[PDB]
Structures are given as structure tokens and as C-alpha cells.
Design a protein around this ligand. Structure first.
Ligand SMILES: Nc1ncnc2c1ncn2[C@@H]1O[C@H](COP(=O)(O)OP(=O)(O)OP(=O)(O)O)[C@@H](O)[C@H]1O
Ligand SMILES: [Mg+2]
Lengths: 385, 71, 50, 906, 54
């Protein structure tokens, strides 16, 4: 009771003050200036018409022009002029054009696009510094590769080695490979990119290779970063369709991904994470070792590892005096970490079933037998016996 | 002719919103603030005298002025 | 205002300048129109007893 | 479910869910029919109890509500509570859940309000007997298994919290209040509370903090002692008990404001003193500010023992931990008298033993020489300071100094700072004095003056055990009539003695600070030194220090620059207190001058601390005031106006800094948000205001010692290439110094880039160069903190020379000050009885997981680290002692303390 | 249920306050694109934009 009040003491006053502070300041900003900056703004608005057609800058020719490719079907030789500089632009950046006669009138985007919006996230990570136990060892391998160059680059220099680039998490479902990456990201306090690899692909053609570029482009602006491209399996060796409407799309999109990962330089400052079911849903060579270090094979919790996962859950639920910690383990045979969480959800539903406010002995025992029954084989001991 | 200046009423309006909002925001912390406070006032003074504090001041209720003119 | 328009707000526009009208909370997609086709859920557990 | 009669016992329960027989009907009819049938009712009480229990397992509210509804009527309608006194009184046992069934089980507003008052009354009256306490208790420990019992006993306890609070507000007190009709006094509710307290600490924790704080009395706290001292060995171990006591103390820092806190820390001390961690006793004794309390823990271990034993050794260690050196004074002397061991003890108490252990770290680390040794113009001046700045702490750079060429080639006020930088090479080491003595007895007075500052810096390494007092040497110089020499002498003397108000030191600085009639811009150091000295114990808020700033204004008010530096010195004096600092705001405000008003707004930041959430709304009222006043009006002097404005800006930030360390520790993260958007507002708002705020950011983060040091330096830095005052870069680096090449990796390049890339003035430049070299330490040799370390609720004491320079436009004069940056965290290595000079293992966790403590306790598992390293500042700011897995046991707790450990291996 | 119940609603209001705080913040961003060396580019800028030449 006393400490949840202390969270309230810290959060209510500081946070409530912060809203109020923003709200007055929006007025207050205006008042210091009354000419010069106001004037320049005023003529920016006369110059720039309403609406503005979006552009994408392909390239700058150094003579006060450029070439843009726009969602308007023909391309344009546009000029660079009015409240924009030649060096305020870089190629491949998104520009704002004048409706009447296309001209770069400045930038207020700088790689602002919807695919950027999905990718950047302001969400809170689900796990923070391995909240849920088990897989102690595997995290002390992600950390060596990913977290460790960011935190201390010096140690690699004494060693005289180049620092790693990226990790590949793979193997079993229900082992929380996608959640360890979230843990590592919160530990450092890095920039995290939840983009999903499957969100670049659509029926419509020719859109995809833009999207692959934009990932590497944004990641480098906000570096240091951790990039997670989750579920790069779907864009693997496989094909969209066996008829039509996708013969090209997977082929261009994957190839284009390998290229801009290597083309950065061999960096140890923008890490990638590829989350994949297996290497049998991807191409047999990726990009392909010395360059992609390290590879982490997830396999099923062992008796030690699954104990650890379980102890977390059971303590957050009523009672444990009824059926010993050991007696849960003993009854269970080795399975993924989802099966361990599943037994506890079912146990809780069973306490509801009885209409108890205690997880009784009976509830534990049934919940254990249920999961084992899904998920079953018996010809391991049938070949034998 | 009417009043054709209201520029300085913006300044009134801005600082009215500042002080009132913090006041509201503070209420949680404000509870314990009163316990701390009352003793130091006993030690020193209320605001200029050690008398007219044998109750809250000397009246539970309050003085309000209300004008019911309508002409 | 730009304090009255929010991120991910659907809006109406003209077509001769694309000048805004007003805010809309009805978001129109084929999946949302699929709910219009389906209509209301029906029936009761004792109709499907046993 | 429904009516099913009396066939077996199961079915009696199902019948009374609809309409009882032996409960509501029977008793009610009996009591209003005859008044001799009350003896039959008495037996029928037991029968009711078991049926109540049986039907306290049904989750639906309606079929217990309606059933016993009419019992609620009966309280006052038939029983009437006075027909035969004990008998009606004791039949209010079924009636108390019945009230709660409408209260909590049923959520209907009208009824919830009305029956709250009644429940309080009937509780109180029936606790006289004590069977109402026992009624609460069968629900506290349960007799049923369902949802119902899990809320009802909790509802009782809130009833109590409501009434007690209402007596505070109400000026009638007792039951002459109209809140409930009830009192928190007498013999009827007091005894209810007494019983209540006993049980709930033992088993729960729920009503326990609300009683304590509401009373506001150290008595209530002394009841808490009695219950806890029982619990410490047979019901949970020793270790678990240590965690309880400090959870209570760290948690309630922003739940006990100053006057409130002082009566409480007294009880907390006693708890610790009884207990086996005397380390906790002493740690807590610093809080109180009481010398007396520190002295008591030492006398308790020393005097009733006639042997070295554990006792003498532990005493040295506890006192050693503060780098205040206040504890150093107390602790040495008694050792001299007793005559155990002189050689182990005096050194271990004093800062002498931290020198040996640094040697082993240094040996590994080598000495990196990347400094420039440029000559001509300002480049001469830049390079000679950077050399000191790159070998801070005990490091070797000796051979370079021994070539006295580049040293002597400086001139002016630079010359003075060049002799000074040399001393910081051998900072916190006995030696240092050798390099300095040579310069001090030859050439211009400038070089003599600079020597004195260095002797001061080196002398932080030995100034206790009654051995090598700075006073003996530095006195002769104060005596000398020249201004440069005398100022230097008394500044350096403050640094060496640190937080000690040793008599000789103090008493030299007492006649002076009272002639500042003479206009000397380099006479700051008179009050600046006394401020450094004061902090470490409860502040005097001495009247000499307040007087002389006003004398300065009488003589001269043409040179503002001096009077701005003085004003800061007074507020820094007053840190480590808050109770007493309320009085002095009034002393300054007595005199009215526009100049004096400048003084008031600074010192206000120090006065209102520890209820600093009020301080925040005030430092915002500050922002608004220039503009608001201007609005109304629309529809010699120069010095006074400029001091006016600037002080305000300075205060706004100072205000924040003081607040964030002492109350919150977790909350610092949020407060950092408060600062960045605050800083933007001032930087945009006034131009003149923007200069103060640029430097202030670097020291804001350092005072709070942030948990996230990744984002904030680096963002400000890019922006500040455009922004003027390149001193901006120096202040970010003083924070970034931290844990090297985590915070510092981006930083060294960024700061080197701006200076090297473009030279737009040799003036702007000099700062740009100084910054890069300044951050670095060779191999993570020491860290820096603007904190005690012992407590992270505390504050610095040797770091205040650092802290001072952020209100100041850049200058040669300023350089002189900056050579000092004493207050370095000693590495928290493991010691034996015959001395060990390295660690074994530690747990690190980058951010602690606990929210019962926020001092720096993480879990037992941590992430395992090796030996031979300084205390990490990012990725291992809290540090825990790892022992549960290694079958080996530490004696001395560590929670990101400065404190060295000691372990017993079996 | 008073220890957690009351404190649950208090938790909730803070989060909602934080969501609202972010929509106040993002409706105003950093001013504008105006730069003194490209204010001189404006002299030529009016003529070419209105002309038929790009
Ligand atoms: N080391 C660990 N970190 C995180 N959770 C873990 C860990 N070990 C086991 N778990 C358990 O595994 C559970 C399942 O995780 P989750 O279902 O997200 O799996 P995944 O391997 O990322 O899957 P998918 O193939 O479905 O994308 C967690 O909820 C948790 O109970
Ligand atoms: Mg996954």
C-alpha cells in the first residue's frame, strides 16, 4: 500500500506539471519576437502555395536544379530555390513541391513516410532485463554481440578485432526469441525498430524495393540503433504465387535487403536482428558468414530452465503451499516456455470454474495433464516398449 | 466608442491559466504540506500577528459580496 | 486547429484544392463494410442446445 | 441455491440464502417480545456464527444482502444497545458484516455514505469489550475461502484512517466532530488501534504506515520498534530485517517533510544501534545532522571492549566512508587516546588507506599522454591547463613537469593557473608538495600564489589522524599583505580540510570575511572557502557570511561581477540544511535595494527544499513575472538591473538541483524531463537568460547523477555549436567524465571537432580544446559523482568548486578555480585484517528492480563481474554484494555506496 | 479492496494524462525553414515560379 503511494508521489506531481508547462509555453514562444523571423515566415507562406504536391528527390544536379520522381506520373526537372539550400538536401530525401510549377521549396519531412511510422515505435518494451526467467546463457550471447559494442567500444580496440554486426535468432516457437531482443533493447536504452519484414510486401508491384532502402536510411540518421526486422522468413526463398501477381516482388525485395546491410560498411553501431522460423524457410546462403555474427539456436527449456520460467508465474497467483514447486516440474516433461505459461492460465480458469480465490491442489493437477495432451507423442516409448 | 484594446488582457489570461492549473496538480502533495506548515506558523506568525488565530481566524463561515442589481 | 486534428485522424477534403472540411470518425474500408453486410449477431445457446 | 429446508446441514444454508430462520426472524422477534429471553438469544449467537461462515463462500452479493437486511434495522429498532447493557452490546456481532454487505458488497452510493458513519460507531463501542477486535481478526486470518473475506477486513481498517485524519482538520476534536460521531482518543478507540497495530505488522503491512504518519509523533514510531525487534530472528532472519528498516527510511523521504522527518530518524537510529549493522546506524546519523549521534555509535563500540577485536576495525571503516571528513575528525583522536594500534587505525579512519589501494589500479592502467604542448598566443595557455586536466587523480606525469620550460612560458593570470594545474596530477596522494615548493619561492607573486592552490588539492589525501595539517604551511601566506597570495592561501586551506570545521581552520576564517570594503574581484575566495567548510553537518547559517556581501555593496556597486559571485557563495553555505534556512530568507529581505533582492531569490531555492514540489511551481511564477508586469503598463543603474535578472535564472535551475537529489532518486528521470523543456523556455525567452542556462544543464545532470546519461549530453551538444559561450562544452564533459567510453564515446569527437574544425576567435577556441581532454581518464581509473555515494539521498561536499562555475562568463580568472575537482569515488575493494588491495566479485544491475527501496538495491542474481575495478556509473550505478551463490559471506552491505567492503571466508 | 482499488484508478488517470500530453506536444514543432542566406534566393524565387520556365 505504501510503495504504490510512493509511485503516485513521483509520477502525479512531475507528470501533471509537464502537461501544464507545455500548454502555457506554446503561447509564450510567440511573444519574444515581433519582426525579422515573423517577416521571413510571412513571405515563405506567400511563396508556398496551397496544397503542396509531395516529391521524392532522386538526385541533385549542381547548377540550381534537380530531378525528382513524384507520385505524378512523369518526372520533373525541378529547380532548388527559395528557403532551401543545395546542402540542406541530400539525395533520396523527401522534398515538398509547389503545385503550380514544381520547385523544391524546402523540406519539413526528412525521411517522413508511413513505412517509417510503422517502424519507429514509442511503445514500452514488454520485458525489461529478462523479467521472465530461463534462457540465461542465450542472452549472454546476444549481449556479447549487440549490447556490448554499443556500451563499450574500447574493449574491442585493445583486442584489435572488428566489432560484430547483427544477430540471427532462430529455431523453436514459444521460446521468446522475439522477447529477448526487446529485453536487450530496453537494457541499453537504444532506438528500437519494430519493423516486420512482411509489411513491405503487397500484391501491387514495384513499391517494395523503396521500403527496403528506407529502413537502412532512417536507422542510420538515428544511430545508435537496434534494428529488428521480425519474420524475414516470408520474404525468403519461397514464391508469392504460382500464377501471377507476385513473380517479381519477393525476388527484388530480399536481394535489395542484403545489399544495403553490407553497403553501410561493416559497422558495429547499427545492429540488425533477423527473426526467422528456420534457415529452411530462407535461402541456403544469406550474406553469409564473418559478417552476420552470431547465430543463436533456440531449443526447448531443460528441467533447470523450465523451473525458472515457472517460479515467476506461480508466485504472482494465489498459494504455492498446496503443491510443492518441485511437484510441478516432476509431473511435466520437457516442452517450450509457452507450455509452461499455458498450464498457469488454465490453472487460473479452473479456480474460476470452482469459484475459488485460491489456486487449490486440484487446479494444479488438471492444468498439468491438459497441456501434455495437445502436443503429444508416445511412440518414443512405444518403439522402446 | 467602445474599448479597442484587449492586447493586455491576453497577458492576464495567460498567467491566469498558469497559476490555477498547478494549484489543482499540487493537491495530492498538498495534503501533507498542511501538516508540515501549521507548526512553523505557530513558531513564527500567521502572516503578521500571533492573535486572530485562536480558531481558523475567528469565523468558520465566510464573507462573500453579492450584487443583485438588475435595474 | 492543429490541436483539434490529431495523428491518425481521418478527415474530408474538397477536390479543387483539397482544402479540409471537418473531422470524421467513420473509417471506411472493406472490412468495416463487411460488418455492415454481416448485420447483427443472433441466436441463443438453447436454440443450439445439446 | 434456493429453499430446500432442514434435511441435512448443507440444505439449511441454501434455505437461509433466501430467508433465514434461526438468524434474522428468531432473534428479532425474541428481543421485542421479552427481555428475559436474552439468555436464550445468547445461545442462539453460536448457531448464527456457523451459518454465517457457511454462507460466506457464496460469491453473489444479492443472496447474502437481502437475507440479513433487516438485521441492520434491528441495531437501533429492537436491540436498542442499552436494554441490558453487556447483552445487546454483544449481539452486535452478526450485525457488523450485515452493514458491510451494503457498504462494499453492494455498491450503491447512497447507502455507502450512510452506513460508513454507523460502522465506525458500532466498531468502537464493541471494542471496549475487545470482541470487536476478535471479530476483525477471524477475517484477517480467514475461516472461509472466497472472495468476500478478502475485502471486508480491509474495509474496517479504512474507517479508522478516515476518522483520525478528520480530527486534524477539525478544531473541536474527539467525538465533538461531526465526521462520524467518533473519536481517536478515549478508552474506546485507542485500544482498538493498539490491538490492530500489533497483528497487522506481523502478518501484513496495511494499516501500519497510515497510523504512524497521522500521529506525527516519535511515540507511535517507538511502538513500531517493540513489534519489529521480536520478528528479527525467529520468524525471518537478520538480513530480511535490515531490508525492512531501510525500506521504511528511503521510501518515506518524500512522505516525511523536514520537521516531520527529524522526530522519526531518532527512532530509526535506535533500531539500527540495537541491530547488528552499525554501518546502518552511522549512515542514518549523517541524516539527522547530529554530531552527537555519530559520536555515540563510535563510543559504543570502542569503550566496553579492551581489544582490537572486530569493533575497532569496523569503527574505522564507517567513519572513513564519508568524504565530508566530518566523520574523520570525530573518529580520529579517540583512537590516539585508547592506543590499540596507531598504524592501522588512524590511517584507516583518515583518507590515507584510499592512497594505497589506488596504486594497484594505477599500475594496470599506465599513463596515457595525448595532450598538446602547443606554444604562442592562447595556444600556450590552453595546452598547459590540459596537461593537468588529462592526469587527474593519482597519476604520473612527473618527467613532463620537471622540464620547467613550458610552465614558465605562461604569463599573466594564466601563469597562476599553470602552477595550480600541476597539483591535480598528484591529487589524493601524500606527495605532490615537491613540484609546487620549487615554483613558490622564485619569480613573480603570480607563481607563488598558484602553488598554494596545489598544496590544497594534494592535501585532500592526508589531513586527519593529526598528521600533515594544511594550516601549518598555508598560514604564513594568509599573513603576507599581497591580495593574490592571501586569497590563494585560504581557498586552498578549505579544500584540504574539506567539510571539517576543525577549530584552527575555522578560526582563521572567522575574523575575516568582514573586510570586503577594499574592491578586490579576486576576494571571493574569502566566503567561498568558508562555504566548502560548512557543508557536511547541520548548517550554522552564520551571521558573519551574510553581513559582508552587504558591506561590499556600500563600498562599490560599479563592479557587479564580484557581487554576483558572492551571492552564490551564501546559498552553497546553507546546503545540507533546510529547517534553519527558512529564517535567513527574512534576514536578507530586511534591507531593500535592487541588488539585495538578487541575493533573496537564490537563497530561497535552499530554504524551500525537501518540499520542493512547491518550489517547482514557484520557479515558473519566476518565469512569468517580467512579462506580466510589462503588460499592464503598455495599455550605475546598469549593474543592479543585470544582477537582478541573472540571479533569477540561476535560481530556477539551483532550485531544481537541490530538490531532485534529496527527496526522489527514481523520480530524477522524470525531473530531467522537467529541466529540458524548462531550459528551452529560458534560452528562447531572454537572450541574457540563455547564457546562464547553457552551462547549467551539464551541472543539472551531474547533481542528480542521472540513470540515463546516453541521450542528454549528446543532443545538447550538437545544438550548442551554433549557440554561444563555448563553456557549454566544458559543463557537459564534467558529467560525461563518468564511466568512460559509454557516455564519452561520441563526446570526445564532438568537442574536438568544434575547436579543431573552425577557428572563429582564439577566445571561443580556448574552451573547445580544454573540454575534450578534461572528460577522459585512462582505463576508467576513477569516476566522478556530485554525490557522497554513501547516501544517494545526500549531496557532494568536495565537488562544490566544480559546481560553482556555471553562472560565469568565460575568463582567465575562472581557470584558477577549475584546477580543483577533488571528491573522487574510491574503488569498493575487499579488505582483510592484514590488508588485501583488490575486490573478488560484485553483482551489477544497471537499474535496480525494487520499488520498496530506490537507493540502489537490486536482486540477489544480478550480472556477475570480476575484480580490480572502480565503481561503475552507467550499467552498474547500483552495486550489490554477491554472496548467496558463492558460499562466502560479506559483513559490510553495499548498495552503490562509496564504501569499501570486507568479507569473511570460512 | 481499498489498497489496490483506489490506487488502480489513480494509475489509470496518469497514463491518460500522458497520452493527452504527447498530442499537445506534437501540434507545435520547431520554426520554420527560413534562413538568412536563402532569404536572398527569394528575390529570383518569385519571378521563376510565376513564369513559364519550370
Ligand atoms: N528467456 C526468456 N525470455 C522471455 N520469455 C521467455 C524466456 N524463456 C521462456 N519464456 C517464455 O516463453 C513464452 C512464449 O514466448 P512467445 O510466445 O512470444 O515466443 P517466440 O519464440 O518469440 O514466437 P513466434 O514464433 O510465435 O513468433 C513467454 O511468454 C515466456 O513464458
Ligand atoms: Mg516471435
Amino acid at each position: 500500500t505504501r510503495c504504490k503511494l510512493k509511485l503516485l508521489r513521483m509520477e502525479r506531481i512531475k507528470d501533471h506539471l509537464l502537461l501544464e508547462e507545455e500548454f502555457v509555453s506554446n503561447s509564450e514562444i510567440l511573444k519574444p519576437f515581433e519582426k525579422k523571423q515573423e517577416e521571413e515566415k510571412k513571405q515563405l507562406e506567400e511563396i508556398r502555395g496551397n496544397p503542396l504536391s509531395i516529391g521524392t528527390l532522386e538526385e541533385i544536379i549542381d547548377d540550381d536544379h534537380a530531378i525528382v520522381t513524384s507520385p505524378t506520373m512523369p518526372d520533373y526537372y525541378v529547380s532548388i530555390l527559395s528557403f532551401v539550400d543545395k546542402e540542406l538536401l541530400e539525395p533520396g530525401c523527401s522534398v515538398l513541391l509547389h503545385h503550380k510549377t514544381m520547385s523544391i521549396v524546402g523540406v519539413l519531412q526528412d525521411d517522413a513516410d508511413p513505412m517509417v511510422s510503422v517502424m519507429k515505435m514509442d511503445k514500452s518494451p514488454t520485458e525489461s532485463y529478462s523479467d521472465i526467467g530461463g534462457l540465461e546463457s542465450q542472452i549472454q550471447e546476444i549481449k556479447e554481440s549487440v549490447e556490448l559494442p554499443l556500451t563499450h567500444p574500447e574493449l574491442y580496440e585493445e583486442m584489435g578485432i572488428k566489432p560484430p554486426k547483427g544477430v540471427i535468432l532462430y529455431g523453436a516457437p514459444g521460446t521468446g526469441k522475439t522477447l529477448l531482443a526487446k529485453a536487450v533493447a530496453n537494457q541499453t536504452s537504444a532506438t528500437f525498430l519494430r519493423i516486420v519484414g512482411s509489411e513491405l510486401i503487397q500484391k501491387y508491384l514495384g513499391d517494395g524495393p523503396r521500403l527496403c532502402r528506407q529502413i537502412f536510411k532512417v536507422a542510420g540518421e538515428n544511430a545508435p540503433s537496434i534494428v529488428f526486422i521480425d519474420e524475414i522468413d516470408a520474404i525468403g526463398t519461397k514464391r508469392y504465387d504460382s500464377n501471377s501477381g507476385g513473380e517479381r516482388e519477393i525476388q527484388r525485395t530480399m536481394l535489395e535487403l542484403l545489399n544495403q546491410l553490407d553497403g553501410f560498411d561493416d559497422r558495429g553501431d547499427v545492429k540488425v536482428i533477423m527473426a526467422t522460423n528456420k534457415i529452411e524457410t530462407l535461402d541456403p546462403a544469406l550474406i553469409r558468414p564473418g559478417r552476420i555474427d552470431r547465430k543463436i539456436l533456440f531449443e526447448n527449456p531443460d528441467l533447470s530452465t523450465k523451473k525458472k520460467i515457472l517460479g515467476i508465474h506461480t508466485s504472482k497467483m494465489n498459494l504455492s503451499e498446496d503443491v510443492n514447486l518441485e511437484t510441478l516440474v516432476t509431473t511435466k516433461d520437457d516442452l517450450s516456455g509457452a507450455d509452461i505459461q499455458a498450464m498457469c492460465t488454465e490453472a487460473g480458469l479452473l479456480a474460476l470454474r470452482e469459484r475459488r480465490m485460491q489456486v487449490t491442489a486440484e487446479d494444479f493437477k488438471q492444468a498439468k495433464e491438459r497441456v501434455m495432451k495437445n502436443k503429444v507423442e508416445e511412440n518414443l516409448e512405444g518403439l522402446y516398449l | 466608442p467602445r474599448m479597442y484594446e484587449e492586447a493586455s488582457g491576453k497577458e492576464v489570461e495567460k498567467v491566469a491559466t498558469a497559476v490555477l492549473s498547478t494549484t489543482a496538480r499540487a493537491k495530492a502533495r498538498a495534503k501533507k504540506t498542511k501538516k508540515e506548515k501549521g507548526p512553523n506558523e505557530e513558531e513564527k506568525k500567521k502572516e503578521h500577528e500571533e492573535k486572530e488565530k485562536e480558531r481558523e481566524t475567528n469565523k468558520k463561515g465566510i464573507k462573500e459580496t453579492k450584487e443583485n442589481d438588475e435595474e | 486547429n492543429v490541436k483539434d486534428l490529431k495523428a491518425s485522424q481521418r478527415v474530408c477534403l474538397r477536390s479543387d484544392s483539397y482544402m479540409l472540411h471537418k473531422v470524421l470518425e467513420n473509417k471506411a474500408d472493406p472490412l468495416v463494410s463487411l460488418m455492415m453486410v454481416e448485420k447483427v449477431p443472433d441466436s441463443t445457446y438453447d436454440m443450439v442446445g445439446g | 441455491m434456493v429453499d430446500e429446508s432442514d434435511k441435512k446441514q448443507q440444505t439449511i444454508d441454501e434455505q437461509s440464502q433466501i430467508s433465514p430462520e434461526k438468524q434474522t426472524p428468531n432473534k428479532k422477534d425474541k428481543k421485542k417480545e421479552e427481555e428475559e429471553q436474552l439468555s436464550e438469544e445468547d445461545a442462539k449467537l453460536k448457531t448464527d456464527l456457523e451459518l454465517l461462515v457457511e454462507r460466506l463462500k457464496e460469491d453473489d452479493s444479492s443472496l447474502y444482502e437481502a437475507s440479513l437486511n433487516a438485521l441492520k434495522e434491528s441495531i437501533k429498532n429492537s436491540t436498542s444497545s442499552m436494554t441490558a447493557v453487556p447483552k445487546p452490546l454483544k449481539f452486535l456481532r452478526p450485525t457488523y458484516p450485515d452493514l458491510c454487505s451494503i457498504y462494499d458488497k453492494w455498491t450503491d452510493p447512497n447507502l455507502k455514505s450512510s452506513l460508513a458513519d454507523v460502522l465506525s460507531i458500532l466498531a468502537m463501542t464493541y471494542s471496549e469489550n475487545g470482541k470487536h477486535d476478535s471479530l476483525r481478526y477471524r477475517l484477517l486470518s480467514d475461516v472461509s475461502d472466497f472472495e468476500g473475506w478478502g475485502h471486508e477486513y480491509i474495509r474496517h481498517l479504512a474507517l479508522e484512517i478516515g476518522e483520525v485524519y478528520n480530527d486534524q482538520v477539525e478544531k473541536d476534536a474527539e467525538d465533538e466532530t461531526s465526521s462520524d460521531g467518533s473519536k481517536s482518543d478515549g478508552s474506546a478507540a485507542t485500544s482498538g488501534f493498539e490491538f490492530s497495530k500489533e497483528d497487522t505488522l506481523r502478518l501484513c503491512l496495511d494499516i501500519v504506515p497510515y497510523f504512524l504518519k497521522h500521529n506525527g509523533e516519535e511515540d507511535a514510531v517507538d511502538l513500531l520498534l517493540e513489534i519489529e525487534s521480536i520478528d528479527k530472528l525467529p520468524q525471518f532472519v537478520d538480513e530480511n530485517t535490515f531490508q525492512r528498516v531501510c525500506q521504511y527510511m528511503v521510501a518515506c523521504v518524500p512522505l516525511l517533510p523536514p520537521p516531520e522527518d527529524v522526530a522519526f530518524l531518532k527512532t530509526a537510529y535506535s533500531i539500527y544501534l540495537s541491530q547488528n549493522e552499525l554501518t546502518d546506524a552511522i549512515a542514518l546519523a549523517v541524516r539527522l545532522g547530529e554530531e552527537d549521534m555519530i559520536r555515540s555509535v563510535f563510543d559504543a563500540t570502542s569503550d566496553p571492549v579492551m581489544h582490537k577485536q572486530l569493533a575497532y576495525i569496523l569503527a574505522a571503516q564507517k567513519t572513513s566512508f564519508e568524504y565530508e571528513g566530518v566523520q574523520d575528525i570525530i573518529g580520529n583522536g579517540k583512537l590516539s587516546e585508547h592506543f590499540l594500534y596507531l598504524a592501522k587505525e588512524l590511517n584507516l579512519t583518515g583518507p590515507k588507506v584510499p592512497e594505497d589501494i589506488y596504486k594497484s589500479h594505477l599500475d594496470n592502467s599506465k599513463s596515457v599522454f595525448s595532450s598538446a604542448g602547443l606554444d604562442s598566443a592562447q595556444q600556450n595557455l590552453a595546452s598547459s591547463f590540459v596537461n593537468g586536466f588529462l592526469n587527474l587523480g593519482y597519476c604520473n606525469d612527473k618527467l613532463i613537469v620537471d622540464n620547467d620550460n613550458w610552465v614558465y612560458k605562461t604569463k599573466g593570470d594564466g601563469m597562476t593557473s599553470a602552477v595550480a594545474s600541476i597539483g591535480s596530477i598528484y591529487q589524493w596522494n601524500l606527495d605532490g608538495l615537491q613540484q609546487l615548493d620549487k615554483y613558490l619561492y622564485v619569480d613573480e607573486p603570480e607563481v607563488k600564489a598558484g602553488a598554494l592552490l596545489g598544496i590544497g588539492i594534494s592535501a585532500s589525501g592526508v589531513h586527519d589522524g593529526e598528521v600533515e595539517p594544511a594550516l601549518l604551511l598555508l598560514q604564513d601566506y594568509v599573513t603576507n599583505p599581497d591580495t593574490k597570495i592571501s586569497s590563494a592561501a585560504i581557498l586552498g586551506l578549505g579544500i584540504a580540510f574539506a567539510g571539517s570545521k576543525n577549530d584552527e581552520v575555522l578560526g582563521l576564517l572567522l575574523p575575516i570575511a568582514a573586510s570586503t570594503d577594499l574592491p578586490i574581484e579576486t576576494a571571493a575566495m574569502a566566503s567561498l572557502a568558508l562555504a566548502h567548510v560548512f557543508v557536511g553537518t547541520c548548517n550554522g547559517d552564520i551571521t558573519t557570511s551574510i553581513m559582508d556581501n552587504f558591506l561590499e555593496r556600500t563600498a562599490i556597486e560599479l563592479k557587479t561581477d564580484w557581487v554576483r559571485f558572492l551571492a552564490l557563495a551564501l546559498g552553497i553555505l546553507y546546503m545540507g540544511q533546510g529547517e534553519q534556512v527558512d529564517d535567513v530568507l527574512e534576514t536578507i529581505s530586511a534591507i531593500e535595494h535592487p541588488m539585495t533582492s538578487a541575493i533573496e531569490v537564490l537563497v530561497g531555492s535552499c530554504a524551500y527544499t525537501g518540499t520542493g514540489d512547491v518550489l517547482l511551481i514557484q520557479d515558473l511564477l519566476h518565469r512569468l513575472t517580467p512579462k506580466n508586469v510589462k503588460g499592464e503598463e503598455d495599455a550605475e543603474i546598469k549593474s543592479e538591473e543585470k544582477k537582478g535578472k541573472s540571479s533569477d535564472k540561476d535560481a530556477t535551475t539551483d532550485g531544481k538541483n537541490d530538490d531532485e537529489e534529496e527527496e526522489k532518486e527514481a523520480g530524477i528521470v522524470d525531473e530531467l524531463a522537467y529541466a529540458v523543456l524548462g531550459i528551452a523556455l529560458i534560452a528562447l525567452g531572454e537572450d541574457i537568460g540563455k547564457e546562464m542556462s547553457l552551462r547549467h544543464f551539464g551541472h543539472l545532470m551531474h547533481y542528480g547523477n542521472e540513470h540515463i546519461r546516453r541521450m542528454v549530453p549528446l543532443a545538447m551538444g550538437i545544438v550548442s555549436v551554433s549557440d554561444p559561450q563555448m563553456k557549454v562544452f566544458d559543463t557537459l564533459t564534467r558529467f560525461s567524465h563518468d564511466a568512460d567510453l559509454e557516455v564519452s564515446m561520441n563526446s570526445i569527437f564532438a568537442m574536438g571537432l568544434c575547436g579543431a574544425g573552425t577557428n572563429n576567435a582564439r577566445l571561443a577556441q580556448l574552451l573547445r580544446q580544454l573540454a575534450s581532454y578534461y572528460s577522459r581518464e585512462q582505463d576508467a581509473l576513477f569516476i566522478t559523482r556530485l554525490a557522497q555515494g554513501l547516501l544517494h539521498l545526500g549531496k557532494g561536499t568536495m565537488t562544490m568548486d566544480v559546481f560553482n562555475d556555471a553562472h560565469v562568463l568565460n575568463k582567465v580568472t575562472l581557470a584558477s578555480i577549475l584546477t580543483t575537482a577533488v571528491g573522487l569515488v574510491s574503488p569498493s575493494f575487499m579488505l582483510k585484517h592484514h590488508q588485501l588491495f583488490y575486490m573478488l566479485n560484485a553483482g551489477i544491475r544497471p537499474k535496480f528492480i525494487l520499488a520498496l527501496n530506490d537507493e540502489g538495491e537490486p536482486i540477489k542474481v544480478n550480472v556477475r563481474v570480476g575484480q580490480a575495478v572502480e565503481t561503475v556509473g552507467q550499467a552498474g550505478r547500483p552495486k550489490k554484494i554477491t554472496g548467496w551463490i558463492t558460499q562466502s559471506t560479506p559483513v559490510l552491505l553495499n548498495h552503490g555506496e562509496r564504501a569499501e567492503l570486507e568479507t569473511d571466508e570460512y | 479492496a481499498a489498497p489496490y482499488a483506489a490506487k488502480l484508478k489513480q494509475t489509470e488517470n496518469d497514463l491518460k494524462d500522458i497520452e493527452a500530453r504527447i498530442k499537445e506536444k506534437a501540434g507545435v514543432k520547431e520554426s520554420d525553414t527560413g534562413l538568412a542566406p536563402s532569404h536572398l534566393w527569394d528575390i529570383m524565387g518569385d519571378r521563376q515560379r510565376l513564369g513559364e520556365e519550370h
